[PDB]
């Protein structure tokens, strides 16, 4: 069985992710902060002990399916709002924000990659990093530390599919065309359908790149 | 007097701006990790009380010009090595470096341009990121932390002109044609000319652009 490991599968994109993954025969392991089990890992994507656990944990469940990963989909985000629900900016945002979020939406991509680095090498896997159109244009339901980490989150993509190309590893994004709602208070199903695209055969020679959502 | 803050005042690109600022009559303060007097500023970029201490003393020396700071240059940018001078991919970057890369070229810049509002507001001062190639294509010369962080700091860049601008300061980023040499082991006057340019009267009107050198 193909085996996919998700992030941020939440309600939206996420639901629609799992969904699809599903009725396409694979296994989908979702990571969530909230608690089939064997198919569920909680953890704190802010935390780099949890996220340590929930790998070795997620490579031990893998050993059923031989070891092997076929698709890590990078879908968690997180865009904290300022007193009162506002949008946070640049002249607002505190350290420990920038540094959590930046951990959430740019490293966990990048530990669990790297972390999970023997199954998706042993599968010939795909790594696919859900970006944002905050990445590129200032929009007043994203934040700064959300947009500058999602623009990060684009570069490390292409860094990652150069790093990652000689092992047999593709590594890709995908930017849909609205804020994703899960960072708020059809369309998902093309995002969804796009990251199903990138993840089996049909893709097998694309990496690197980044497909925007119309 | 006119007044710059630069950090990042290395040979090269530093060396070329001081020269064009201070043949143009400016008082310029560079921001360096190494020991007139008075207008050199020895700051470690990598630690947050350091910043703070230097932003303090900054804003005492600018008391003699009025308290008004007409621009800040962040052309500082470290780039760390992997073992044996090797470039350190987005696999073998550690947490520790990551952090340390994302503080000096991106948190950096904004905890200075926050720090130093007062002054840029009483001013209408200008804010000029260098931004680089690497934010934008994989290069053999700048690791990942230096690359992804770059892309950072663009966004951040048009994420700040949002934010300052109705405080009528303008903040833009300009991106040599090549690679910082300061990273490493004629086009150094036009970065210079551009930084120059984007703090001076002839570029009132511009803001949130990022400059590519040819």
Redesign the interface.
């Known amino acids: 069985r193909k085996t996919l490991v998700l992030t941020g599968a939440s309600r939206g994109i996420g639901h629609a992710t799992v969904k699809r993954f599903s009725l396409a025969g694979w296994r989908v392991i979702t990571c969530s902060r909230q608690d089939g089990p064997e198919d569920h890992i909680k953890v704190d994507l802010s935390d780099?002990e949890d996220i340590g656990k929930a790998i070795a944990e997620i490579r031990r469940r893998l050993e059923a399916n031989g070891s092997k990963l076929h698709a890590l989909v990078n879908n968690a985000g997180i865009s904290p709002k300022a007193e009162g629900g506002r949008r946070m900016?640049?002249?607002e945002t505190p350290?420990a924000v920038?540094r959590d979020v930046?951990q959430v939406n740019?490293?966990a991509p990048?530990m669990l990659a790297?972390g999970l680095?023997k199954e998706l090498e042993a599968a010939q896997g795909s790594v696919v990093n859900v970006t944002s159109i905050a990445?590129?244009?200032?929009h007043p339901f994203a934040g700064?530390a959300y947009?500058?980490?999602?623009?990060?989150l684009?570069?490390?993509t292409?860094?990652?599919a150069?790093?990652?190309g000689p092992y047999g590893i593709r590594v890709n994004a995908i930017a849909p065309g609205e804020i994703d709602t899960a960072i708020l208070s059809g369309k998902t199903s093309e995002v969804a359908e796009t990251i199903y695209f990138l993840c089996t055969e049909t893709s097998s020679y694309v990496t690197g790149s980044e497909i925007h959502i119309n």
């Not at 990445?135 to 200032?138: M, P």
């Not at 947009?147 to 990060?152: I, V």
């Open positions: 780099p900016n640049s002249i350290m920038w930046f740019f490293m990048i790297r680095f990445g590129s244009r200032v700064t947009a500058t980490s999602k623009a990060a684009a570069a490390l292409r860094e990652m150069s790093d990652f």
